[PDB]
Each structure stands twice: as C-alpha cells, then as structure tokens.
C-alpha cells in the first residue's frame, strides 16, 4: 500500500481500455443503459440494459446480470472475464439492481415494476423485490448452484411504505448482506425541523428548502431516504429483508449509493442529487443504525442544472445531479480514486482523479473536453501486489452504440 502522496500536474496516470473482454456489442440504434459494476476478492459483477432506439425513451431488448473473475489479461493490466450470465424474461420490468459479493457468489437485489422507474412513479409502484444468486465459478451438474432466483416476500420496512435497492453495489459483514437502499416515506410522516436547514450564509435560501427537496419535487407525495437492505444468510428459513435508514447528519434526498469494503472497513458514498453538491463519502461509523462520517471534501462535486449547479452549497429545492462515486485507497491519508464530470451544468468531460479532502493530487481526462458522460462507478483492488482501480463510464459516441466503457487505471506507488 504505497501510492504517491504529492500533488502534480504531470500526467502519471495511464488509463487502459478494457471493455474488449465484455459482451458490449455495437449496433445501429442499440443503446446500453442502467449499468452496474462491482469488484470484490478477484471477482466482479456487471449489468446493463440493452434498449432499441432512444436511450431514455426506447424499447427494452435485453437485460443481463453477469459475474466473473478479474485477472491479469496478459500485459499486467486487469480485465473482466465473465463466467456466468443471467437473462430475465421481461427486461422492461427489472429496475435498480444492486450486487453484493459473499462467499463464492454474487447476490444481486433488483426491483420489479410494471409501471416504469419506481422513483418517477412512486405511488403507482407496487413494491416487488427479488434476488438472483450467481456463482463466480460455475459447476456442471449442480442444480441451482450456478443460478438461483428468489422472490422476496418477508420485508421489514419500519415506518416506510415501500423500500427498494438504490445503488450499484453493497457489502457483506460476516454472513449478513447489506445493500444500498431507499425508503419511500410519505411527506406527512416525515419528521424534520426547518431550523436545521443550514441557510446561515445563504442569503437567497429559505428554511423550508431542505424538507421540500427530500422529495423529487416540492409537492411530492413521498420523500426519499437512503439506507441499507439487510439480509442475514445464517438465519435461513424464509428470507427476511430489513431496511435500515441512514442518519440525519448531513441529510440529503435518497439517491443511488454505494457501501463497500476498503482496507478492512465499510465505506459509503451517496450521490448528491440536490443542493448539497459537494461529494458525500466517508467511513461508516456504524452499519446498524447507519451513520457515515462524511468527509469535509472541498474539491469534488457533480454537475447539476441552473438552480443547484456544480459547487452549490446552499439549500435549494432541486433534483439535479449525477452518480460519480469514489473509492478509498488509503485510509491513513484518506485518499480516494474516482471519476468526476468536469462541467457545471451538463454531464460531460469525465476525469479520473486521485484526491484528498482538500486537494486533487493527480488526474487525467478519460475522453475529449466535450464528450458526454453521465454515471461512473469505480472499484479498486490489488492485482498481485499492485493497486488498480476499474472505472465504468457511461459515454456517448458522437459517431455511433452509446454504451458504457471500462477503464483500468494503475495507481502509482512512487512519484
């Protein structure tokens, strides 16, 4: 665990394209969307949605959930080699999948909906959850070992009407799985004190802005609160799903999140989907109840719109932003690696960066200044004894399929 700890404008990062080993075929009017990436213990999980036509309004063609091994492909660069792919029969009904690795399998928790994205149709969505277990090293003659699908029926939600997985990847603790999740709570039941919304140095802010922006709109029936979905494998019997709400310290609207293992401890990231646009990440103080020691990070934010653009800090009623997580690679110096979008109000210009709380040590663009890019997911790991990070980046091809790309970036030990 040696990395360069000195800032430099030199380009010491050499990103490698590693999408060659994944089944992301390119065609005329095929769009690949809703991606997922997880990397754990030399294995990985991946998913996307193949659409025909519009990337946002198009018809669903195929959803894939696949796992496999991350291996040195032959030139000391890691790459993802799929071993086990599952395909659901109705690809338009599967939403918000989240993968967690545990003892030889990847557990992907998905939402089932026939009304579209539950976030954008909260009241019409009838809560329906399921789980698909994929073995990272398949066996012949094994029955349900390679693939197992289970519908979830025992759900403990607490005070929330509905719960749902909400993020790319989760973490295991012993034999209990934890998934990034969100609880739908009606506004009427939401306990929040206006005096707590920090407008002190915000001349144009109003006390009500925090409470209003906990839903996708001010008059939304529900507010969204992020949290965890808990599944204890040692219990057995009929599976029980348990929602754990996140603590109210630095509370923002429920947004896609990630809880992950780094150097032996759980770390959390939450997408900034409203007015608090500085990156939200940090070590988990307690898993249950869920409390995060958010970093006071002053250098990384996310693109928004005109009401809460990049670097906005003062409370407004806005539902804007992108998911751009970061991965802690050094807890002693609290250094992280991730891709951010270098644009104030549009999703473009992706830049892979290694940074502390108040300083970007080094970084490198992943495309041209103008290239469109939305979601990015970064997971880091050891390959032999070398530190690598793998970054999934949604990228738009001006010429052509608009699809995710995969980059491997080696983190230098020296400067």
């Amino acid at each position, epitope marked *: 665990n040696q990395i360069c700890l000195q800032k430099t404008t030199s380009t010491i990062l050499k990103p490698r394209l590693i999408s060659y080993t994944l089944p992301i075929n390119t065609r005329e009017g095929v769009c690949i969307t809703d991606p997922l990436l997880a990397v754990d213990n030399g294995f990985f999980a991946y998913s996307h949605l193949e659409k025909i036509g519009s990337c946002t309004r198009g018809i669903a063609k195929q959803r894939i959930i696949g796992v496999g091994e991350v291996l040195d492909r032959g030139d000391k660069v890691p790459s993802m080699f799929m071993t086990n792919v599952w395909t659901p029969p109705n690809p338009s009904t599967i939403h918000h999948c989240s993968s967690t690795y545990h003892e030889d399998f990847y557990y992907t928790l998905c939402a089932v909906s026939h009304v579209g994205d539950p976030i*954008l149709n909260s009241t019409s969505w009838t809560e329906s959850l399921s789980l698909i277990r994929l073995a990272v090293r398949p066996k012949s003659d094994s029955g349900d070992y390679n693939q197992k699908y289970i519908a979830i029926t025992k759900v403990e939600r607490g005070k929330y009407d509905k719960v749902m997985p909400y993020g790319p990847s989760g973490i295991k603790q012993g034999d209990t799985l934890y998934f990034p999740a969100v609880g739908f709570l009606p506004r009427t039941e939401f306990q929040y004190n206006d005096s707590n919304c920090p407008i002190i140095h*915000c*001349k*144009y*802010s*109003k006390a009500e802005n925090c409470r209003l922006s906990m839903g*996708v*709109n001010s008059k939304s029936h529900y507010i969204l609160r992020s949290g965890l979905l808990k599944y204890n494998l040692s219990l057995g019997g009929d599976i029980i799903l348990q929602f754990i709400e996140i603590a109210d310290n630095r509370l923002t609207i429920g947004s896609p999140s990630k809880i992950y293992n780094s150097l032996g401890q759980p770390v959390f990231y939450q997408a900034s*989907y409203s007015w608090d646009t500085m990156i939200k990440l940090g070590d988990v103080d307690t898993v249950d109840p869920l409390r995060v020691q958010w970093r006071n990070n002053s250098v990384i934010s996310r*693109p*928004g*719109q*005109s*009401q809460c*653009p990049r670097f*906005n800090v*003062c409370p*407004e*009623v806005c*539902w*804007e*932003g*992108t998911y751009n997580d970061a991965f802690l690679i050094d807890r002693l110096n609290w250094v992280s690696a991730g891709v951010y979008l270098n*644009s*104030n*109000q*549009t*999703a*473009e*210009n992706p830049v892979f960066a290694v940074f502390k709380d108040n300083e970007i040590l080094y970084q490198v663009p992943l495309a*041209e*200044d*103008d*290239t*469109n890019a*939305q979601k990015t997911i970064t997971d880091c790991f050891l390959l032999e004894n070398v530190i690598w990070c793998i970054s999934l980046v949604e990228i*738009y091809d*001006t*010429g052509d399929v608009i699809r995710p790309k995969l980059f491997a970036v080696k983190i230098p030990a020296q400067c």
Partner: antibody, heavy 127, light 109 residues
C-alpha cells in the same frame, strides 16, 4: 397563460445607466430560471445574463460582466437588469425570457432554453 | 466562445419542405434548440433538446442532431413560415448561452 412584460427602455448617452424590469405571470415565478436576451438591430439574439429561481446564482455573458447586474424580487414577480456604463454596442431590443423546461429530470441535455419570450424593450445608447 | 454557424439564406416555394442547418464543432455533444422569429415579433421555440417538440407547434417542424451539424427541417412550408430561424446551445466550457447567426427562410409568393 404565461406573460412576460418588459419596461424601462429608452434613450441614453454612452456611460449612462438604465434599469429594466420584467413583469411575470402565469407560472410560479420563483421555480424557474430567468434570463435577459438582447437583439441588436439587424442581427441575431445574444444572451446577456440569467438568474436562478431563488436568485442564489447569477450568470453573465463576457460582453456584459462587470457592467450589468441581474436581480429578482420574487414577492413582486419581477426580473431586473441594472445596466451601467452603457456603450453604443449595447443598443438593442432586450427580452425577458423564461426557461421553457418543466418536469423532473436529474440532468438536462440542454439546460438553458427559452419559452416564452417577452415582446421586448428597446435600449438606444447614442450621443 | 463556442461557435454556431448557420447559412444566411434559404429559399423554398409554398408547400415545398425546407432544411436549415446549425453547424458547430462536435455539435452532437450539445443539446440544440431552435427558435422562429417572424417580422416584428419575439422569437418562439419550435424545437428543443435536439428533437423534442413543444406542445402547440405543428408536427411538420422537426429537429435532429448528429456529428457536426444539427438540422431543422420544415415540411409543407407556408407563407406564414417566412421568418428568421436561430439555433441555440449551452457552452459548458464558458457557461454561456450561444446563438447562431440566423437563417432567413424565404418562400416566394
């Protein structure tokens, strides 16, 4: 229906100051980004400045930064433009313009477009 | 600072189908909007976000964006359609709204 009604234009010498107003109705004023777009005679429009619904963020074009001020009184549903140290090239028709997007999206392909425009107010900087 | 380039003049006859161009470097990396300006009036949006159509705008006005040129094609062109057409984007390298120079659409009665 949405109406935007500009006023305050007139004749002024170079180096003077004028204040434009825009009266807005038909929508919740404080939830939309508002902008001033000017059109010099015989030329196309030019974006001058914009302001977020609360007024927390103000945006300016380089040609205008440091001389004009965009502000907004939400209790009066009024958008303002204080133009100072006016130059001859500022001569144009100045439009109130409302951001046309309504809906819930996390990101927008085009985060700034205009619907509708006011009918405009004419500013003549001349000696 | 980002530059949008338009042809200054375009002519058709009544009911003929016209095509107006908005050129910018890698303009497919930007969302394009189109405005129509009849003489003595304020501009009016006819296309937003490359191809989306605002309600109240006839379907014959269509927009598209690809590569280095966006195009606003109008079919069944009519004497009412004689106006100036401007394209418009957001430049995130300058945080500026940028307009094109405009295209005079002439239909000869």
């Amino acid at each position: 229906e949405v109406q935007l009604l500009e006023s305050g234009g007139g004749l002024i010498q170079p180096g003077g100051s004028l204040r434009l107003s825009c009266a807005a109705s038909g929508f919740t004023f404080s939830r939309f980004t508002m902008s001033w777009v000017r059109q010099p005679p015989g030329k196309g429009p030019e974006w001058v400045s914009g302001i977020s619904g609360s007024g927390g963020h103000t945006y300016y074009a380089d040609s205008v930064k440091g001389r004009f001020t965009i502000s907004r009184d939400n209790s009066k549903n009024t958008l303002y433009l204080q133009m100072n140290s006016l130059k001859a090239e500022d001569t144009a028709v100045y439009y109130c313009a409302k951001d046309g997007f309504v809906g819930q999206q996390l990101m927008r392909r085009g985060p700034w477009w205009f619907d509708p425009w006011g009918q405009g107010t004419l500013v003549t900087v001349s000696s | 600072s980002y530059v949008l380039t338009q042809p200054p003049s375009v002519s058709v006859a009544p009911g003929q189908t016209a095509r107006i161009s908005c050129g910018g470097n890698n303009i497919g990396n930007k969302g394009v909007h189109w405005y129509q300006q009849k003489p003595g009036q304020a501009p009016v949006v006819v296309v937003y976000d490359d191809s989306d159509r605002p309600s109240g705008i006839p379907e014959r006005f269509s927009g598209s964006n690809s590569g280095n040129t966006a195009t606003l094609t109008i079919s069944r062109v009519e004497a009412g359609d004689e106006a100036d057409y401007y394209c418009q984007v957001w430049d995130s390298s300058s945080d500026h709204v940028v307009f094109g120079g405009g295209t005079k659409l002439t239909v000869l009665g």
